């Protein structure tokens, strides 16, 4: 009669926080607070656990992703990551660079489905370098295959041939089952939006893309409410500039996903607003802002926390099925922007320039009202 | 005099869609510009792409490769069409394009992306961002994942299909494209940005390593490195920051097309593919546009400018190349626009009429 579960009708989730490097800890600290407050309003409690990753892990135990961090992440209900990278580690051997830890945690958590929404918010339309009429109303979702393809393909390496010359190689490889699963996510995703899915590949050159297109095509019959189309990656790169409003959902591989989602991100004009979700089958998902560790403003209360806050909303929605709590966060971010609040990266003439903590305070204020 | 005329052999590969229309115009413009410099051409038309598939059942006939290799330069129209997209992999039009690039060993692909002042409004980027864009992509054209082995679709023991390709570069392949790009930047504004994914891929670690080692051979050139995903963003945010970019086959394909659309006018952009020895390959970057094939709507200016790159880079005919460039400029300054570049207050014309306007500007001089 109090509700499901064993704590007075409340739901308690275990969250692993991976603040990381640069501005990561600052923005995660704020999102944590917004998460707690919005959750509390829906009868949701959290056990948080901070663990090291990236440069922080390197300075601590000499690897970018400690076994103990993986264990903690795997035993959790969801993972919220801050940011990865710094100048200090830039002359390290490549297994000892912060980015390595990020690739390793994706693989370890088997979060093959990366969701990256790119929307132009009406309050920030003028931040885009695209003309207003082209940028306004952009609202697309890139579904990127995150744990396969060339990023993780074998064989790979740099070797010296018999002529004494170096040869570097990587393998773009996909098994049918890897394509099917990311395709299914994208079809389900498009179904819940405008019902349009664009599969992006290089099928006029690459056998790996021919298989991609074959499997995606064969799945279309299981989603008759979804209009499937296909586009070559180079044409997709042009169409994002020419008419980004044409897209609802895009599905593509690891490397094309990396390039196109980042292109779509910059087209919106405000990188500091953009969240992302990485989902697995049945295990904890990984949620993180798409921006970097921005080391040059670290510790200066300058960072935009909104992308991480919105990643926490994605954590609630996609990771935990806690939709009302997610909506409370999304609403509060909107109220802050409507009230004229802007951190430095989204500042325009006549708005209220605020620091990181102060922006969090405004979101918090709105959640609690 | 007849004895002292300069003569070149040009192989024409009209290809598919609007390819034949635009190449026919560029051929005429080429003849007229050259003749004013005492240069005459022997043209031979050969099949490639869908056109070769329809004639002999392969996208690149042996006879075409022979003709191209024996010539001084190759001018190509366009490849591809819906007619052949349901073809087996070995028999799609595009395979012919990859095959001719490989056969001619044209590893150095030059794709200049500029915003013309007459056409600044055609970009979807704000005027202040698009105006003054002027970059060159130097793309490695005959190596990398496009040609790497092993490759295929196989069925494993379980009956499950696995599709795979190999991104592979030997150091000397990187060295050679890099040298071309350094030399390119030196002739431009002295800035080179090398683009890779060296934070993930071994092949790109070698890429960055070789380009870095070569920097000291061109100490007058300013070299920087950028990840391909960052480059895709920087082209949107501040494309004016770039002079010359060098990158591999697949990143070059993506980034150059992104840069092209950023300028706003795909129908204006030429390209050159150059080899160490032998004829170069010159073609517009637009596609076959099969919906307007035979409708006299095509913009011939990109192929006309590709013929200018042919003269300039392939044949060293600098004065003839300038005559063509000058004439395209005259035609645009006279207000002529094909449909793809039309704006209110201009003269909307078809393909043939645009060509004739460029032709009479050439012959004016
Ligand atoms: C840092 C890099 C390894 C990473 C990637 O390529 O996935 C980043 O670019 C991203 O998009 O999250
Ligand atoms: C294969 C073919 C479609 C070609 C390529 O990918 O190189 C085209 O995109 C280009 O840029 O010339
Ligand atoms: Mg990226
Ligand atoms: Mg292309």
User: What are the residue ranges spanned by the domains of chain B?
Assistant: 1-365
CB-nearest to B202 from A156, A173, A234 is A156
What does DSSP assign to residue A241?
Answer: H
- B139 CA distance to ligand 3 middle (Å): 21
Q: Which residue of chain B is at minimal alpha-carbon distance from A269?
A: B237
**Taking the alpha carbons of B309, B311, B315, B317 in that order, is the dihedral positive or negative?**
negative
Selection from A181, A359, A337 nearest residue A253 by Cα: A181
Out of B164, B200, B228, the one facing A207 most closely (by C-beta) is B164
Longest dimension (CA), chain A: 77
Coil, helix or strand at residue A178: helix
Instruction: Give the mutation target among A99, A111, A266, A288 for probing the ligand 1 site: most ligand atoms within 8 A of CB.
Output: A99
Residue B184 contacts residue B244 (beta carbons within 8 Å): yes
- Residue spans of alpha helices (H) in A77-175: 98-109, 132-135
Find out whether A106 and A73 touch, Cβ atoms under 8 Å.
no
Nearest CA in chain A to B205: A168
**A359 upstream amide cis, omega within 30 of 0:** no
Structure tokens belonging to residue A125: 């339309």
Q: Which technique?
A: X-ray
C-alpha B45/C-alpha B42 separation (Å) is 10
Instruction: Answer whether the bond into residue B150 is a cis peptide, omega within 30°.
Output: yes
CA distances from A213 to A199, B52, B290 (A): 7, 26, 23
Query: At residue A157, what are phi and psi to the nearest 5 degrees?
Result: 145, -175
Nearest atom in ligand 1 to B200's CA: 3
Structure tokens at A121: 């918010």
A176 with B164: Cβ contact below 8 A = no
Whose CA is closest to A236, among A201, A196, A266, A207? Answer: A201
**What stretch of H or E contains A79?**
strand A78-83
Q: Is A153 left (phi over 0), alpha (psi -120 to 50) or beta?
A: beta
Active site residue B146: yes
Residue B227's DSSP bridge partners are B196
Provide the token pair at A142: 């890139």
Instruction: Give, in words, the CATH class of A1-369.
Output: alpha beta
Encode chain B in three state secondary structure. CCCCCEEEEEEEEEECCCHHHHHHHHHHHHHHHHHCCCEEEEEEECCCCHHHHHHHCCCCCHHHHHHHHHCCEEEEEECCCHHHCCCCHHHCHHHHHHHHHHHHCCCEEEEEEECCHHHHHHCCECHHHHCCCEEEEEEECCCHHHCCCCCEEEECCCCCEEEEEEEEEEHHHHHHHHHHHHHHHHHCCCEEEEEECCCCCHHHHHHHHHHHHHHHHCCCCEEEEEEHHHHHHHHHHCHHHCCEEEECHHHHHHHHHHHHHHHCCHHHCEEEEECCCCCEEEEECCCCCHHHCCCCCCCCHHHHHHHHHHHHHHHCCHHHHHHHHHHHHHHHHCCEECHHHCCCCCEECCHHHHHHHHHHHHHHC
User: What are B44's strand-pairing partners?
Assistant: B11
Report helix, strand or coil for A165: coil
Point out which residues pair with B223 in neighbouring strands. Answer: B192
B76 dihedral zone (left: phi>0; alpha: psi -120 to 50; beta): beta
- Alpha-carbon span A335 to A115, nearest angstrom: 24
B55 exposed, middle or buried (CB, 10 Å; 0-12, 13-18, 19+)?
exposed
For chain A, where are the alpha helices, taking DSSP H only? 24-40, 55-61, 67-74, 98-109, 132-135, 176-191, 207-219, 233-242, 254-268, 306-314, 320, 323-338, 356-367
Set A21, A77, A151, A201: catalytic member: A151
DSSP H or E stretch at residue A117:
strand A113-119
Q: Rounded to whole angstroms, how far apart are CA atoms A253 and A206?
A: 12
Find the length of chain A.
Answer: 369
Please say whether the beta carbons of B97 and B48 come within 8 A.
Answer: yes
Biggest CA–CA distance in chain B, Å, is 74
Q: What does the alpha-carbon distance between residue B90 and residue B73 come to, in Å, rounded to a whole number? A: 26
Q: Specify whether B197 is catalytic.
A: yes
Half-sphere exposure of A211 (CA within 13 A, CB side): 24
The span from the CA of A246 to the CA of A133, in Å, is: 13
Ligand 1 pocket (Cβ < 6 Å) reads A 99, 102-103, 258; B 199-200, 229
* Cβ-based neighbours of B336, under 8 Å, separated by 6 or more: B346, B347, B349, B353, B354, B357
The hierarchical CATH code for the domain B1-365 is 3.40.718.10
Q: A256 with A235: CB under 8 angstroms?
A: no
- Let me know: does A74 contact A236? Beta carbons within 8 Å: no
Surface-to-core class of residue B5, CB atoms within 10 Å of its CB (0-12 exposed, 13-18 middle, 19+ buried): exposed
């Amino acid at each position: 009669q109090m509700g499901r579960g064993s704590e007075f009708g409340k739901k308690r989730y275990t969250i692993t926080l991976l603040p990381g490097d640069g501005i990561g800890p600052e923005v995660v600290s704020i999102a944590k607070n917004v998460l707690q407050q919005a959750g509390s309003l829906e009868g949701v409690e959290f056990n948080f656990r901070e663990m090291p990753i990236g440069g922080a892990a390197l300075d601590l135990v000499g690897v970018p992703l400690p076994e103990e961090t993986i264990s903690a992440a795997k035993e959790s209900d969801a993972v919220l990551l801050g940011a990865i990278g710094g100048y200090k580690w830039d002359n390290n051997e490549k297994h000892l660079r912060p980015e390595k830890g990020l690739l390793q945690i994706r693989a370890a958590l088997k979060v093959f489905a990366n969701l990256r929404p790119a929307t132009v918010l009406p309050q920030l339309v003028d931040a885009s370098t695209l003309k207003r009429e082209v940028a306004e109303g952009v609202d697309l979702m890139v579904v990127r295959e995150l744990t396969g393809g060339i990023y993780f393909g074998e064989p790979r390496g740099i070797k010296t041939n018999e002529n004494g010359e170096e040869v570097g190689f990587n393998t773009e490889v996909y098994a049918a089952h890897e394509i099917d699963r990311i395709a299914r996510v994208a079809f389900e995703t498009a179904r819940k939006r405008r019902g349009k899915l664009c599969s992006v590949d290089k099928a006029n050159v690459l056998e790996a893309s021919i298989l991609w297109r074959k499997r995606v095509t064969a799945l279309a019959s299981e989603y008759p409410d979804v209009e499937l189309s296909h586009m070559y990656v180079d044409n997709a790169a042009m169409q994002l500039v020419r008419d980004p409003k044409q897209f609802d959902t895009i599905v593509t591989n690891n490397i094309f996903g990396d390039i196109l989602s980042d292109e779509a991100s910059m087209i919106t004009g405000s990188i500091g607003m953009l969240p992302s979700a990485s989902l697995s089958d049945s295990g904890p998902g990984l949620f993180e802002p798409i921006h970097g560790s921005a080391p040059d403003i670290a510790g200066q209360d300058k960072a935009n926390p909104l992308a991480t806050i919105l990643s926490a909303a994605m954590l609630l929605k996609y990771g935990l099925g806690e939709e009302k709590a997610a909506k409370r966060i999304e609403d509060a971010v909107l109220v802050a922007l409507n009230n004229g609040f802007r951190t430095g990266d989204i500042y325009s003439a006549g708005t209220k320039l605020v620091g990181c903590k102060e922006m969090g305070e405004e979101v918090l204020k709105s959640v609690d009202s």
